[PDB]
Enzyme design. Structure first.
Site, mmCIF file in Angstrom:
data_model
loop_
_atom_site.group_PDB
_atom_site.id
_atom_site.type_symbol
_atom_site.label_atom_id
_atom_site.label_comp_id
_atom_site.label_asym_id
_atom_site.label_seq_id
_atom_site.Cartn_x
_atom_site.Cartn_y
_atom_site.Cartn_z
ATOM 1 N N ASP A 1 10.626 -0.609 20.204
ATOM 2 C CA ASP A 1 9.696 -1.836 20.718
ATOM 3 C C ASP A 1 10.724 -2.770 21.546
ATOM 4 O O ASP A 1 11.100 -3.636 20.645
ATOM 5 C CB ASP A 1 8.597 -2.187 20.164
ATOM 6 C CG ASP A 1 8.251 -1.432 18.905
ATOM 7 O OD1 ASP A 1 7.383 -0.319 19.687
ATOM 8 O OD2 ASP A 1 8.090 -1.444 17.823
ATOM 9 N N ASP B 1 6.139 -11.280 20.981
ATOM 10 C CA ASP B 1 4.967 -12.160 20.500
ATOM 11 C C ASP B 1 5.373 -13.430 19.477
ATOM 12 O O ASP B 1 4.747 -14.245 19.112
ATOM 13 C CB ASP B 1 4.368 -11.358 19.189
ATOM 14 C CG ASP B 1 5.148 -10.704 18.139
ATOM 15 O OD1 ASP B 1 6.479 -11.102 18.143
ATOM 16 O OD2 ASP B 1 4.869 -9.860 17.330
#
Length: 207
Positions: free
Chosen positions: A120, A10
């Site tokens: 993640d 992100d």
């Protein structure tokens, strides 16, 4: 122990990139819009109007066909952020197209609290998720919000610094989708701590 994995990128400043998040010499490095290291650890996250984004060199890469080094946002059962920031874990995938492969990952951020163990993996083009810091950083990355791009060809439009990690997902990782894994905390390899600049003081007490 065992856990679940996912993928993302992100462009946000890593949670372990702030002071006082872990017992380390210094927090994880953040980078400016042009992927240059920022030496001010108090810099505001690019995902909150600030200039601090995720560094491109904090991408995964293959050591060989069976082993890769990388980074991830982590969340472990019964533990807190202080226990994992900048810690390294040796993972062995137990499902997906690359079951059997190994990967040492350093925790550079914290994932959601689900009660279980999950990593993640930081992979350019794996999906911006909730917070899209890549749009303000350089215009954004292509791909679905969750999961990111679908084909290796899509990496071609990525800013050069992010291409290697993007392609790694299709080459070494064989585009594995959320493969499970067994893990154990191990002492961090120099290659990882040198990239983030973050080393836990207790790192010497582990495998």
């Amino acid at each position: 122990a065992n856990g679940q994995s996912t993928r993302y990128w992100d462009c946000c400043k890593p949670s372990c990139g702030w002071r006082g998040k872990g017992p380390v010499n210094q927090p994880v490095y953040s980078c400016d819009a042009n992927f240059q290291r920022i030496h001010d650890f108090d810099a505001v996250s690019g995902c909150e109007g600030g200039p601090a984004f995720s560094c491109a060199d904090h991408s995964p890469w293959a050591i060989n066909d069976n082993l890769s080094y990388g980074f991830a946002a982590t969340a472990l059962s019964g533990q807190t952020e202080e226990s994992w920031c900048c810690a390294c874990y040796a993972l062995t995938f137990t499902s997906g197209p690359v079951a059997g492969k190994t990967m040492v990952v350093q925790s550079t951020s914290t994932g959601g609290d689900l009660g279980s163990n999950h990593f993640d993996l930081n992979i350019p083009g794996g999906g911006v998720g909730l917070f899209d810091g890549c749009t303000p950083q350089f215009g954004g990355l292509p791909g679905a919000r969750y999961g990111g791009i679908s084909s290796r060809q899509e990496c071609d439009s990525f800013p050069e610094p992010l291409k290697p990690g993007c392609q790694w997902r299709f080459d070494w990782f064989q585009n594995a989708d959320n493969p499970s894994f067994t893990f154990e905390r191990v002492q961090c390899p120099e290659e990882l701590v040198a990239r983030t600049g973050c080393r836990r003081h207790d790192d010497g007490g582990f495998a």
